[PDB]
Design a binder for this molecule. Structure first.
Ligand SMILES: Cc1cc2nc3c(=O)[nH]c(=O)nc-3n(C[C@H](O)[C@H](O)[C@H](O)COP(=O)(O)OP(=O)(O)OC[C@H]3O[C@@H](n4cnc5c(N)ncnc54)[C@H](O)[C@@H]3O)c2cc1C
Ligand SMILES: O=CCCc1cc(F)cc(F)c1OCc1ccccc1
Lengths: 661, 132
């Protein structure tokens, strides 16, 4: 449906009020069901009108003229719902033409650290709400971990490149606001073993299925055997996979032992039968000789001599009958024993080639989580699974940077300004920063509130890149320690000609060892110009950062030469290698749910800091230091849409604090 | 509730994780266990192969021809004397006694037991067969 689709596309249940809505409309959620339905329709219809045209501001008056009775009768209710949706960034977010030009009277002063997507989204909101906003950005560009390489006609993303499903995704709205050239990712992905040969379809499917089954197994291990702590430490996904694999190898050996034991049991039953026959044959042989002697006493004979012949005869035929039955049993046992000798259970759980192809699937998971599997929380690593958008994954053909650049239009952004210190007190805040080009140039920014969108990698840094005065409390620093911050890198290879399969967006390289499984394991064909992107994932990410570009590119060309032929792969005209762990403005790629962490740490990251009073005995201060970024949003961590959502959240929160709700 | 064909008992999980090198120890002892079961199959095969070589020839040099005899209702003196010896040797095994005489049914043998019980001291003869 339509109003129902608007709710779904806003990540809202269409037939129920949320906790956020309960908080701003306690009168409605605690009141009769009929008013709740009216509220829910007003909300869903307002969402719909905005979604049906996100290029222009949806105003309260516009909304009301489009509502029809009975819903447009309580204009206070409509105005409340519209204001709520606007304040929380569910309508009139991103880049839209403004009906009412922005009032010149600004209220409050906010410094935003970082002009990645979260920082930029917050800034746009806060400026829309009438506040004075300045962003401080250490780099010489916007976008942060949205970072597009551009040279000539070559365009390639060094950070985010995939828009997940558009259904429920706020990047859907943005894509109608910005010219993004979105293109579906065909998920066909051939694998080539290290010898350049393709993985036979038989094997590609067997091992992928086993991969999925090993994952279900770790989840069974987690949820049914409560295998979540081992030797006083939280169990990891990788560690649970080891246990599962060991048990499948154990079961194969158990099965072999059971099988050969059936053969032993049968062999021994046969041995016992043969011994019985050998003795019976001898007894029969001796008995025959007796019957022979007695029957050669020639007639006429007395009746005892006749009885001797006739009873030896009788005894002999009975023993022969006994022997014939034992020989029938012998052929049945030799049958059973020939069937067993032909039904051998499996020899191995996984051959070497199998385990290599399996490692490719593990490397693929290490890519998606940007971290080695030995660091992922077994209990929680997939905790954002229930929030996946619907629809095909897509790439941004003209470079994802078009989004942050578009968001930056109109904002006051100081590039080349590295924040060094954040000061927050009951009367306001001071942010101290230096010019990255000449660090001696110092800058003081005073403001009512600081929105910190520094990456979790930067917050983790010891000794710190950024000092908080007073220091962040332990509940926040402990969360910063526990959370995972991973790593993932890309190699951009620009050629003058296409030598790969043009109708295939992915293909895999199956590394020879587990250690190297993440090293150049996946190639992407995503762009108009002949460009391949190669991924470095898992344990390889961090190690390959200490290897020169020429060696990394060499390894790439070697792999490709093996798959496509040595004469088919020219030298690249341009190449770029990312090193995100080493990037001091990132210190990694994106967060992961580490063993020992959980979804609640993302909530802790999002919680603002409130200073103590200046004068003792003075009233409770308001909060002063806010946080956004992909590490601050429990349900959509580690994505662009999660960062954007987190900025929208904080801007509503800050505006509620400093403008009133 | 494990995936089909996956094997994951609580018992085994603890065995493979109770120790730092527990898994490899588990799979090692299973390997050696399979080696000693295969070793044992080799011995019994080779032992059975020697037994089969003794049964070469079956019992064919020793099987007598089977004669059918028309089952006659009348007892010659010779057939009575056979029966008494058969009783002496086989006891109440009416089938064996029939096979010795050749022309007397199991019923006729059993009837013989009663009719000549007195004249042939058949009770003494059964007692005689029981002493050995
Ligand atoms: C290799 C890679 C691939 C990815 N794949 C995808 C994908 O395809 N799709 C997807 O949705 N997500 C993907 N992600 C994740 C996504 O890119 C991020 O979650 C998101 O862009 C980060 O947004 P943010 O605004 O929270 O942080 P950032 O964009 O990191 O913004 C923080 C900003 O603060 C700046 N800064 C740092 N230190 C200072 C300082 N001292 N003073 C001032 N400014 C400072 C940084 O330079 C940066 O501009 C990927 C990320 C990477 C790196
Ligand atoms: O290059 C960037 C990928 C980073 C990434 C991190 C996430 F946490 C969620 C994502 F959607 C995502 O981007 C697309 C993707 C989805 C599934 C598997 C791999 C990648």
């Amino acid at each position: 449906s339509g109003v129902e689709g608007a709710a779904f596309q806003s990540r809202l249940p269409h037939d129920r009020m949320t906790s956020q809505e309960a908080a701003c409309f306690p009168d409605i959620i605690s009141g009769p069901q009929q008013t709740q339905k009216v509220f829910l329709f007003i909300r869903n219809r307002t969402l719909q009108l905005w979604l049906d045209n996100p290029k222009i501001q949806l105003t309260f008056e516009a909304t009301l003229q489009q509502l029809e009775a009975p819903y447009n009768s309580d204009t206070v209710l409509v105005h409340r719902v519209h204001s709520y949706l606007e304040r929380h960034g569910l309508i009139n977010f991103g880049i839209y033409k403004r009906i009412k030009p922005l009032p010149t009277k600004k209220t409050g002063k906010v410094i935003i650290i970082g002009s990645g997507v979260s920082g930029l989204a917050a800034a746009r909101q806060l400026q829309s709400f009438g506040m004075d906003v300045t962003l401080l950005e250490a780099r010489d560009r916007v976008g942060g971990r949205v970072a597009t390489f551009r040279k000539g006609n070559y365009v390639a993303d060094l950070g985010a490149m995939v828009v997940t499903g558009l259904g429920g995704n706020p990047m859907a709205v943005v894509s109608k606001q910005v010219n993004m050239e979105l293109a579906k990712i065909k998920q066909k992905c051939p694998l080539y073993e290290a010898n350049g040969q393709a993985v036979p379809k038989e094997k590609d499917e067997m091992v992928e299925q086993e991969f999925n089954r090993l994952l279900e197994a770790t989840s069974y291990l987690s949820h049914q055997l409560d295998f979540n702590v081992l030797n006083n430490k939280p169990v990891s996904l990788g560690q649970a996979l080891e246990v599962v694999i060991q048990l499948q190898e154990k079961h194969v050996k158990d099965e072999q032992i059971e099988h050969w034991k059936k053969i032993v049991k049968t062999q021994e039953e046969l041995k016992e039968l043969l011994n019985k026959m050998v003795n019976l044959k001898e007894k029969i042989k001796e008995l025959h000789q007796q019957y022979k002697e007695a029957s050669e006493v020639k007639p006429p004979r007395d009746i005892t001599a006749e009885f001797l012949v006739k009873s030896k005869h009788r005894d002999l035929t009975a023993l022969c009958k006994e022997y014939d039955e034992l020989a029938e049993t012998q052929g049945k046992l030799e049958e059973k024993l020939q069937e067993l000798e032909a039904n051998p259970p499996s020899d191995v759980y996984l051959s070497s080639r199998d385990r290599q192809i399996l490692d490719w699937h593990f490397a693929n998971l290490e890519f998606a989580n940007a971290t080695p599997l030995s660091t992922l929380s077994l209990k929680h690593w997939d905790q954002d699974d229930d929030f996946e958008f619907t629809g095909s994954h897509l790439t941004v053909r003209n470079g994802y940077s078009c989004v942050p650049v578009a968001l930056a239009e109109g904002l006051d952004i100081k590039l080349n300004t590295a924040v060094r210190q954040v000061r927050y007190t009951a009367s306001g805040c001071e942010v101290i920063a230096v010019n990255t080009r000449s660090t001696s140039q110092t800058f003081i920014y005073k403001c009512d509130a600081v929105l910190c969108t520094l990456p979790l990698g930067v917050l983790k840094q010891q000794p710190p890149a950024v000092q908080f005065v007073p220091p962040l409390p332990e509940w926040k620093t402990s969360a910063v320690q526990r959370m995972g911050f991973g790593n993932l890198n890309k190699v951009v290879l620009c050629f003058d000609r296409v030598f790969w399969d043009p109708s295939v967006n992915l293909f895999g390289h199956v590394g020879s060892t587990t250690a190297s499984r993440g090293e150049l394991f996946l190639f992407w064909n995503l762009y108009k110009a002949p460009i391949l992107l190669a991924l470095v994932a898992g344990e390889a990410a961090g190690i390959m950062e200490n290897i020169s570009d020429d060696v990394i590119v060499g390894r790439c060309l070697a792999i490709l030469k093996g798959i496509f032929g040595s004469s088919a792969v020219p030298q690249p005209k341009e190449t770029v290698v990312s090193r995100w762990r080493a990037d001091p403005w990132a210190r990694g790629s994106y967060s992961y749910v580490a063993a020992g962490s959980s979804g609640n740490d993302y909530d802790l990251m999002a919680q603002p800091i409130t200073p103590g009073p200046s004068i003792p005995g003075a009233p409770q201060p308001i909060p002063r230091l806010f946080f956004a970024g992909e590490h601050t949003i429990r349900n959509y961590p580690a994505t662009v849409h999660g960062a954007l959502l987190s900025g929208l959240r904080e801007a509503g929160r800050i505006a509620d604090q400093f403008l009133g709700a | 509730k494990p995936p089909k064909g996956m094997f994951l008992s609580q018992e085994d999980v603890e065995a493979v994780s109770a120790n730092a090198t527990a898994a490899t120890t588990v799979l090692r002892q299973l390997d050696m266990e399979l080696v000693s079961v295969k070793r044992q199959i080799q011995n019994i095969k080779q032992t059975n192969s020697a037994l089969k070589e003794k049964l070469d020839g079956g019992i064919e040099p020793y099987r007598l021809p089977e004669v059918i005899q028309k089952c006659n209702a009348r007892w010659t003196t010779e057939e009575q004397l056979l029966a008494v010896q058969a009783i002496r040797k086989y006891g109440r095994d009416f089938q064996a006694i029939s096979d010795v005489i050749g022309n007397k049914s199991v019923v006729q043998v059993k009837n013989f037991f009663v009719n000549y019980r007195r004249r042939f001291n058949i009770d003494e003869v059964l007692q005689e067969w029981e002493a050995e």
